[PDB]
Ligand binder design. Structure first.
Ligand SMILES: O=C(O)c1cc(S(=O)(=O)Nc2ccc(Cc3ccccc3)cc2)ccc1O
Ligand SMILES: O=C(O)c1cc(S(=O)(=O)Nc2ccc(Cc3ccccc3)cc2)ccc1O
Lengths: 400, 400
């Protein structure tokens, strides 16, 4: 259960005065920020722009998209100078506004536009659940503006990216669903037929088995949903790929084609992790708090036995910190076995013990959060290997 | 004027349907993110935690702090399930909530807690100006919880950090103001006397000349204000250091002292850049769009003359990109002179031209956005020097 593990590792907390709002503590924010860096490296590789849209836009714009009519109950609203604003539940309209600055042509397409977009949705309080279902969350979101001829490759690209990213966390159980047209929707039947068919053909061409999930699509288009499970085998939508022939038209998006006529771009929506919040909840439960070294808030703790070795521990801490490792010293006058138990409960990958022998030899005794005693080793070697474990974003520690 | 420069370099835009809200385009967001990385490197060096508080909190909490009575008209409110929430105009209360999780002692102090905190303030629309005065902005904010004996060193730390960071951008107009007690305020007169005296002593010990700005302090404490000027020599509050003996008490913050009695922590508020938005407006005008290489959205553009060299350009682009440089290839079927002009107008620091001779020799012809022609040079040398210019965050290029 990620809520208990979350308290025990001091990752985050929640309070009545802000239901479904996460207060990220230093250590949870470290995880979050590490996820950002990882995502960003993929955005670079798969050629995405990164942008940032505003939190609020005029209610008039949300009426034009169909959100007001189809999504009103999940929207926070506010006002200023006799005008109403909606806090964004989604990043797409913001992205279209950016697309609409400056003349576009087919030469600019496909245009891939990513955002770590803070969304707010007024979910019923009784549906809230730790980090999985919150009122304020951050999507690793993007929108791809493309031609009709480009849809197949771009949808394939999103799917490639899901499996690429998910294999770093080592996911076996990726159940895939295709969520079809809901009762309340925009666009014609033909648009929905085409959009559902293309997502389905994409999955089939990639040899991905999936089930239909009738009526669980968005009002602006169907979804491929990559489903992950928690400790009670509850299904949680994480990765999501959507196809939309409606919003660009409504927000007057256009580009000049080769013909030289105005054409409306197709819009692909996708989020790989889903939200950072939910994904971290899934990870917390998947790993039972044993985060891979690259995600771990504290990667190394260095301990002395007596005051005799505190000097050496501080030098070592400095050294590791300079090598770019998240490290802490534990100099408390506590029995070493007491210290090991505490940092094991905090899921610290590596615990370095410094007795007189380690001092004398410039060595360090290594223990892991799994109770494994790896013996004395040369410091430079431990540093080099920690860096390799981090750089490769390895699932498994030294040995395993 | 940063608004015109902003349009012509595609950094950001603004629209009527979101007054005082910035839409960051890819290139503006790159600058913003580079400022984050820079700030973060300083947070590491000066030993800050980094956290993230929620956007919304219950109106009741804002009444407790005195914001509802003293700051109401600048606050956006929304509601859910018959409760009212405020969109945070500040990060301090959020930080205190985090501080209040888990028992604290003097051993934890000083506790430095930083956030890139998205603030929203309902400024009068007639006061809005480009990026300088907006409704939605991101403070490079922090709050330092400390004892009374620690105030001097911690305030000195904030001041050291301002001049440290500002010298990277090369500021030689740092006018400093000391903003004293406003008419509407919390805390006693003795608290205000002490707080004004300490800020004044701090400025004088650092040999900083300043003017008083009587009555322009915050309701929760006096401010040191570091003032930067725009192209029309208008004064803009950027860096800010505040001293607060009142908010922690109101939010029931406490720690166990050495004596072993409950004490209320002193709180120092500070923002070095101020907001990212304002600071970027200042920089845009200060540099007239010629950002230092480390800040530049695109650092290098590589161009071919004919199709003959496209292969070589792609290999080179790959190489530079892997060396960690923000690089683009320009393979359009355009005259080279046309291409160079375009990237010069966009203030790309370096333009690499590849003709048959560069191909044959594994060399590259380098020019700058200033029209400086550096001749043909070895590629590895160009890479090495670009990396040095970036790592050192130097103001001046290869050339000047
Ligand atoms: O275009 C969009 O607005 C968009 C919407 C979704 S979604 O709302 O269908 N998918 C989604 C699923 C889970 C999360 C995490 C989460 C956490 C709490 C509540 C709701 C969602 C976020 C998005 C996904 C990608 C998009 O570009
Ligand atoms: O923690 C702080 O530093 C802090 C600072 C302020 S401040 O408003 O005095 N500092 C400041 C200076 C410039 C900007 C940029 C800005 C401000 C208003 C509108 C637009 C941009 C932001 C904050 C208010 C509350 C705080 O907790």
């Amino acid at each position: 259960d990620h809520r208990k593990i979350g308290k025990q590792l001091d990752l985050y907390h929640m309070q009545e005065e802000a239901p479904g709002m996460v207060f990220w503590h230093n250590d949870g924010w470290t995880i979050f920020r590490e996820l950002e860096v990882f995502v960003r490296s993929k955005l670079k590789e798969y050629q995405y722009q990164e942008v940032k849209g505003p939190f609020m836009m005029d209610r008039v714009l949300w009426e034009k998209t169909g959100h007001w009519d189809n999504y009103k109950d999940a929207m926070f609203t506010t006002s200023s100078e006799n005008r109403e604003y909606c806090i964004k539940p989604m990043n797409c309209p913001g992205h279209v506004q950016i697309f609409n600055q400056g003349l576009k042509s087919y030469r600019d397409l496909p245009l891939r536009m990513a955002e770590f977009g803070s969304c707010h949705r007024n979910e019923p309080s009784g549906s809230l659940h730790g980090l999985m279902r919150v009122r304020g969350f951050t999507q690793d979101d993007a929108h791809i503006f493309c031609t009709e001829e480009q849809i197949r490759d771009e949808v394939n690209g999103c799917i490639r990216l899901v499996y690429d990213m998910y294999s770093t966390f080592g996911f076996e159980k990726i159940v895939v669903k295709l969520s079809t047209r809901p009762e309340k929707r925009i666009g014609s039947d033909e648009m929905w037929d085409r959009a559902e068919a293309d997502l389905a053909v994409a999955l089939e061409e990639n040899n991905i088995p999936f089930e239909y999930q009738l009526g669980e699509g968005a009002f602006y288009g169907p979804k491929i949903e990559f489903t992950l499970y928690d400790c009670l085998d509850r299904a949680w939508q994480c990765g999501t790929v959507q196809l939309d022939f409606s919003l660009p038209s409504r927000l007057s998006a256009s580009y000049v084609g080769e013909d030289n006529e105005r054409k409306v771009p197709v819009m692909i929506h996708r989020a790989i992790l889903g939200s950072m919040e939910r994904f971290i909840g899934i990870l917390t439960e998947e790993f039972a708090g044993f985060f891979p070294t690259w995600l771990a808030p504290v990667q190394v703790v260095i301990m002395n036995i007596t005051d005799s070795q505190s000097e050496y521990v501080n030098e070592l801490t400095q050294k590791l910190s300079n090598a770019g490792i998240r490290v802490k010293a534990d100099l408390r006058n506590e029995k070493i076995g007491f210290k090991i138990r505490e940092h094991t409960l905090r899921r610290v990958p590596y615990m370095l013990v410094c007795g007189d022998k380690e001092v004398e030899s410039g060595k360090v005794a290594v223990r892991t959060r799994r109770g494994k005693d790896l013996g004395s080793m040369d410091v430079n070697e431990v540093i080099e290997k920690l860096q390799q474990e981090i750089r490769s974003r390895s699932l498994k520690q030294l040995e395993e």
